[PDB]
């Protein structure tokens, strides 16, 4: 019958086929071979139908070696799940469950404190311990009315061809990803992939341009259907000045009516303008999802807010251990215990708290996180918050 | 030419006329006479074109006596601006400016620490010192897919005719408004107006129904265009249990495809469901705007987060005074000083911070508030935050 194992190079065509059929956006077998370099030996699982040769791939899943920045500018080795897929012929046969269990086992044994993914659908991954941990926020600016506020900072920005300033983009992004929770190291192979997208595609996307600043850049292109809409695919700013200067340039695209960007909830853009409504939220969705693999390792690794007095509690993760958790001076100490729990939550809830994108008090109101103490709740809220708001580095 | 003065009863027809022409959703002379009882003697200003009787009103503005809840469950007398209108024939002649100046003078002399409004546009009121202080967040739930999470609490709620349960609605709302920043006291005259809207309007809105719980209620009606959409005009919940029970009932409206509600950003609804995407944000906008009239009175009045250690700074408001600000133990002391400023911001920025809806660090990134100290920023951030997320009580 069905069997779970690590793919051979023989299994690839089957996997590419399943991938082509599962993901519209499938980047070709070629492009899939850049991401492959991020897959460790043993980072992939397939389900074959039958035993023997000529068995076909009906399930696949893999993880990539990533580096995720978490609050306090700490970088965690992170296992990024990707290309997860079950054949349309084998739904509801337990394949996803078996493949995820096997991959989590490998991820845990390998020593990753956290796993992560982007969710094709919202009701799938909670059951596997993943919680949404960043929030994608689309802003659409009607630039026809947009005027900058007297207080806004600001000729330092240049309009450039992306493919001619790779080094400058890499250096800026690299600084960006080390300072911001949600940041991911972007390897050379992914910079190759990204820069190849910049050329105009006949029957596809119009060519991309870049706005470059010593401390930030934006990549944008005119929408293919709506020609009065500019789409900002990526904007990395490491200083507030760079962020403002880049927006002055984008609002300077007089040929356009609207500029849109997928950004984060605390993007200060609306406050740069004299009319904050002009920056409309047109779309909101979960971004990066997190599964805490090792609770103590993860809790001790991140920084915590200093604006909270030292406190101690006992945290129980459903089927993930019980811990004495002490937080003070922006650090956590997290040790085994069997003392009565003061806070309980499923594993996924913890990943949702972990980068500061969700407040413990909000999850508590949903009974997703249970405690006796309201004071304890406010303290967790305050401790887990992030100085630097969490952003999403790139889908994978 | 033009003159600014307090209206007589002679001026009402002119004002009604100007009102009908300025506000589509105008409270007929009938309803306008309910809100009128909330207007204090001398709370109204008109601009007449010409002198002596026989002059038509070309400008009007007024304020109402309101009670606003701010963090720490503190209730402030608040002056609520409304029916502000300039005749389409007299735009750009300085009328709004003159009317706001005169009203602000009256509001200050009368002893209001704060003024508030709902803004018909986003680029008008900042210049007068108002900052957006709450955020309206529309959620549209596709209830065909909505399943409650195993953890969600939950019988208890009843489907009732609104008009037969006024006493119960009043008591619940009254409890609600005293506990939540943004809460407003709703006077009898406004309950009269509200319950009169519940009846089906011929050629207008459909009949309203209510879901009632001991500790919360929801008012909803089928949308008049889209008959698979239920619109929740108001949902007041005092306990998390009530909030979840009401949503189980709403998700129970099987003849509906979608339920929508205007709510706040920290609404825990998305976390009650197994798929959080199902609660889609379909719209976001500034709600209540605040003008701090008296900086020291306002800063000392509200409670601050207990999680921040005591600290002291010097706050300068552009044309609003400089103050030594000391915050500790959830309390602020705020006294005159000429010591060098550590923080500066326009008056409107302070209004946006006041209820916890906007983070100081976000306004600083936009340069709307200047300091030279990042630690000071984190502390302001943490101190001004609210334990109970800020919500919007009713438009006025």
UniProtKB/Swiss-Prot annotation, chains A, B:
<dbReference type="InterPro" id="IPR041380">
    <property type="entry name" value="Acetyltransf_17"/>
</dbReference>
<dbReference type="GO" id="GO:0046677">
    <property type="term" value="P:response to antibiotic"/>
</dbReference>
<dbReference type="Pfam" id="PF13527">
    <property type="entry name" value="Acetyltransf_9"/>
</dbReference>
<keyword id="KW-0808">Transferase</keyword>
<dbReference type="GO" id="GO:0061733">
    <property type="term" value="F:protein-lysine-acetyltransferase activity"/>
</dbReference>
<dbReference type="GO" id="GO:0034069">
    <property type="term" value="F:aminoglycoside N-acetyltransferase activity"/>
</dbReference>
<keyword id="KW-0964">Secreted</keyword>
<keyword id="KW-1036">Host cytoplasmic vesicle</keyword>
<dbReference type="InterPro" id="IPR016181">
    <property type="entry name" value="Acyl_CoA_acyltransferase"/>
</dbReference>
<comment type="function">
    <text>Effector that is released into the host cell and affects host immune responses; it negatively modulates inflammation, macrophage autophagy, and cell death through redox-dependent signaling. Acts as an acetyltransferase. Acetylates 'Lys-55' of dual-specificity protein phosphatase 16 (DUSP16)/mitogen-activated protein kinase phosphatase-7 (MKP-7), a JNK-specific phosphatase; this leads to the inhibition of JNK-dependent autophagy, phagosome maturation, and ROS (reactive oxygen species) generation for enhanced intracellular survival of M.tuberculosis.</text>
</comment>
<dbReference type="InterPro" id="IPR022902">
    <property type="entry name" value="NAcTrfase_Eis"/>
</dbReference>
<feature type="active site" description="Proton acceptor; via carboxylate">
    <location>
        <position position="396"/>
    </location>
</feature>
<dbReference type="InterPro" id="IPR000182">
    <property type="entry name" value="GNAT_dom"/>
</dbReference>
<dbReference type="GO" id="GO:0044161">
    <property type="term" value="C:host cell cytoplasmic vesicle"/>
</dbReference>
<dbReference type="GO" id="GO:0097691">
    <property type="term" value="C:bacterial extracellular vesicle"/>
</dbReference>
<dbReference type="Pfam" id="PF17668">
    <property type="entry name" value="Acetyltransf_17"/>
</dbReference>
<dbReference type="InterPro" id="IPR051554">
    <property type="entry name" value="Acetyltransferase_Eis"/>
</dbReference>
<dbReference type="InterPro" id="IPR036527">
    <property type="entry name" value="SCP2_sterol-bd_dom_sf"/>
</dbReference>
<feature type="domain" description="N-acetyltransferase">
    <location>
        <begin position="2"/>
        <end position="153"/>
    </location>
</feature>
<dbReference type="GO" id="GO:0030649">
    <property type="term" value="P:aminoglycoside antibiotic catabolic process"/>
</dbReference>
<dbReference type="InterPro" id="IPR025559">
    <property type="entry name" value="Eis_dom"/>
</dbReference>
<comment type="subunit">
    <text>Homohexamer; trimer of dimers.</text>
</comment>
<protein>
    <recommendedName>
        <fullName>N-acetyltransferase Eis</fullName>
        <ecNumber>2.3.1.-</ecNumber>
    </recommendedName>
</protein>
<dbReference type="Pfam" id="PF13530">
    <property type="entry name" value="SCP2_2"/>
</dbReference>
<feature type="binding site">
    <location>
        <begin position="92"/>
        <end position="97"/>
    </location>
    <ligand>
        <name>acetyl-CoA</name>
    </ligand>
</feature>
<feature type="binding site">
    <location>
        <begin position="120"/>
        <end position="121"/>
    </location>
    <ligand>
        <name>acetyl-CoA</name>
    </ligand>
</feature>
<feature type="active site" description="Proton donor">
    <location>
        <position position="125"/>
    </location>
</feature>
<comment type="function">
    <text>Can also acetylate multiple amine groups of many aminoglycoside (AG) antibiotics, leading to their inactivation, and thus contributes to drug resistance. Is also able to acetylate and deactivate the cyclic peptide antibiotic capreomycin, but not the other anti-tuberculous drugs isoniazid and pyrazinamide. Acetylates kanamycin (KAN) more efficiently than amikacin (AMK), even though Eis seems to bind AMK with higher affinity. Does not acetylate and inactivate streptomycin, apramycin and spectinomycin.</text>
</comment>
<dbReference type="GO" id="GO:0043655">
    <property type="term" value="C:host extracellular space"/>
</dbReference>
<comment type="similarity">
    <text>Belongs to the acetyltransferase Eis family.</text>
</comment>
<keyword id="KW-0046">Antibiotic resistance</keyword>
<feature type="binding site">
    <location>
        <begin position="84"/>
        <end position="86"/>
    </location>
    <ligand>
        <name>acetyl-CoA</name>
    </ligand>
</feature>
<keyword id="KW-0012">Acyltransferase</keyword>
């Amino acid at each position: 019958t069905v069997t779970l194992c690590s793919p051979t190079e023989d299994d690839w065509p089957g996997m590419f086929l399943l991938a082509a059929a599962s993901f519209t956006d499938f980047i070709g077998p070629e492009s899939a071979t850049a991401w492959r370099t991020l897959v460790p030996t043993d980072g992939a699982v397939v389900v074959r139908d039958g035993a023997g040769p000529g068995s076909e791939v009906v399930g696949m899943a893999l993880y990539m070696d990533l580096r995720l920045t978490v609050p306090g500018e700490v970088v965690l080795p992170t296992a990024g799940l990707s290309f997860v897929a079950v054949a349309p012929t084998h739904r509801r046969r337990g394949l996803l469950r078996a493949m995820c269990a096997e991959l989590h086992r490998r991820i845990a044994d390998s020593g990753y404190p956290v796993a992560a993914l982007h969710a094709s659908e919202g009701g799938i991954y909670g059951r596997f311990g993943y919680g949404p941990a960043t929030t994608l926020h689309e802003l659409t600016v009607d630039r026809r009315f947009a005027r900058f506020h007297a207080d806004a900072p600001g000729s330092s920005v240049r309009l450039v061809r992306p493919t001619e300033h790779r080094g400058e983009f890499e250096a800026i992004y690299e600084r960006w990803r080390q300072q911001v929770p949600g940041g991911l190291l972007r390897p050379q192979v992914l910079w190759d992939e990204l820069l190849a997208e910049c050329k105009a595609a006949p029957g596809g996307d119009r060519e991309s341009f870049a706005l470059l600043h010593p401390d930030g850049y934006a990549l944008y292109r005119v929408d293919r259907t709506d020609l009065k809409l500019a789409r900002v695919s990526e904007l990395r700013a490491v200083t507030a000045d760079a962020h403002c200067a880049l927006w002055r340039a984008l609002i300077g695209l007089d040929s356009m009516e609207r500029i849109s960007i997928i950004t984060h909830p605390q993007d200060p853009l609306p406050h740069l303008l004299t009319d904050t409504r002009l920056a409309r939220t047109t779309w909101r969705q979960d971004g990066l999802w997190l599964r805490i693999m090792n609770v103590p390792a993860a809790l001790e690794a991140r920084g915590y807010a200093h604006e909270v007095g030292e406190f101690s509690t006992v945290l129980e993760v459903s089927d993930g251990g019980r811990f004495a958790l002490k937080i003070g001076d922006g650090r956590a100490r997290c040790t085994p215990t069997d003392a009565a729990a003061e806070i309980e939550m499923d594993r996924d809830v913890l990943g949702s708290l972990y980068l500061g994108a969700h407040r413990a008090s909000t999850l508590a109101a949903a009974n997703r996180l249970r405690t006796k103490d309201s004071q304890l709740l406010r303290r967790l809220d305050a401790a887990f918050a992030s100085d630097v708001p969490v952003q999403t580095a790139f889908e994978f």
